[PDB]
Amino acid sequence: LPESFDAREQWSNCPTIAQIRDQGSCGSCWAFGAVEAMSDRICIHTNGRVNVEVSAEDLLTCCGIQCGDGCNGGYPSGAWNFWTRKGLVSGGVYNSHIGCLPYTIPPCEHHVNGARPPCTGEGDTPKCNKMCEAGYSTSYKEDKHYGYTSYSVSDSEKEIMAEIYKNGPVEGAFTVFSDFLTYKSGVYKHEAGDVMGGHAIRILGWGIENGVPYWLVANSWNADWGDNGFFKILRGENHCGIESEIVAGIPRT
Amino acid sequence: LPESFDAREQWSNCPTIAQIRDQGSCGSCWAFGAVEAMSDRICIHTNGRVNVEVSAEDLLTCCGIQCGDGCNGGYPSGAWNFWTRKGLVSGGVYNSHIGCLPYTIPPCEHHVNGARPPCTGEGDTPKCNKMCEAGYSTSYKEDKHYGYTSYSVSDSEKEIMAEIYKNGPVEGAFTVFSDFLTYKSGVYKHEAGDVMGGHAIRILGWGIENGVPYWLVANSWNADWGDNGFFKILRGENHCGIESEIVAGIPRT
């Protein structure tokens, strides 16, 4: 395995890999890390042939109890199961009008200052509506993309790197302390700060910074939070549980 | 797989299986659900020839960063990793004077009106003394029991059932709402209450009670909580994430 590896470069023909979304005022990181990683892997596994943005909106709103409580939180491995059974329709970002169900919850500022309204944290979960927006070419049922398999990856550094390196970014989760909120650059090691619970992400690579090993991670807090929306978190120490809750899956291709 | 299965009935020569512990005023769920299931599995693996209580004190104090943060919470899969790498010693309950390092934190009342002192928030992780209790036959080192492998079990009802049936109890985890705390009997389905966090537990069976499928689970809040320290929780719909974070492991021979 390589000492450093970036999925964005390994499959540069696959643009979802490089994309930072914004979940909005809805705690649906669980839904975002999955559909981000599923998009990436539908592109990787058809070798470029198929490139969709999988709908964050379909997952979030139509999964139900097996996934969690929507905007209030949920479970990654419930998401990848849903994909495998009921599939996910396409849906681009808010107001993109791309795909069946683009996301209906607007961008907002996530522990940063900018032009977008502050995020407000409390946000209703949209009802499940099994219908593509007006204009879309196909019907909801037709637009479903399916998972062939889902699985957890064991807490093994070398096993996590081999899975990404072979098959694409993963969804993971980690415990979020308050000192993470203000990450700008470099490798995140939790030091000060209290605990704000566990949070799901997409892991898309690894590398070495000043000797400190790290994981290259996409947050779903828009591109103005952190390092253009990405963060590096310390690798090899189960640091804040980052090597504990890896889930992934192979598309029905 | 049978309609129902109890690890206690199946490996009745192994008494740790039926045993309930008390973690005291220390959020070390992660440690208990581990060392309970390893105890069972050492006993099951050896056909009962080896019957020890794996020390919750050793794992809690000596694991370090990879397991999380001691009495403030931690990660199950780091526990089982450490077990395969460093091993874990014998240690009975508080004042048991059984084994190398019994537990040094005393029993207390977890959300129930009994006679032990109420439990005193969370505590402070002890230091790691790599020395057994004065009076113990063997050295710390000579007292280590090693895991051969540790691994995550995927979010699959049938998979999780087959693992328990073939290898014995597993550690799991789930989100806790306020309405859990006053469980007495029957099958717990979350209907109301505030979140409190995900907490680690040991799963040791399943069955059906009045139409509803469940998991037989052991809490580490002593025997005056719940149904003799035990509870049942809805099975088959990833309820409070119960099927999402399953870890386990094989004892070294």
Swiss-Prot record, chains A, B:
Residues annotated as glycosylated: N113
List of catalytic residues: C29, H199, N219
Intrachain disulfide bonds: C14-C43, C26-C71, C62-C128, C63-C67, C100-C132, C108-C119
Source organism, top-level taxon: Eukaryota
Chain positions with N6-acetyllysine modification: K141
Name under which the protein is recorded: Cathepsin B
Species of the source: Rattus norvegicus (Rat)
Gene symbol of the encoding locus: Ctsb
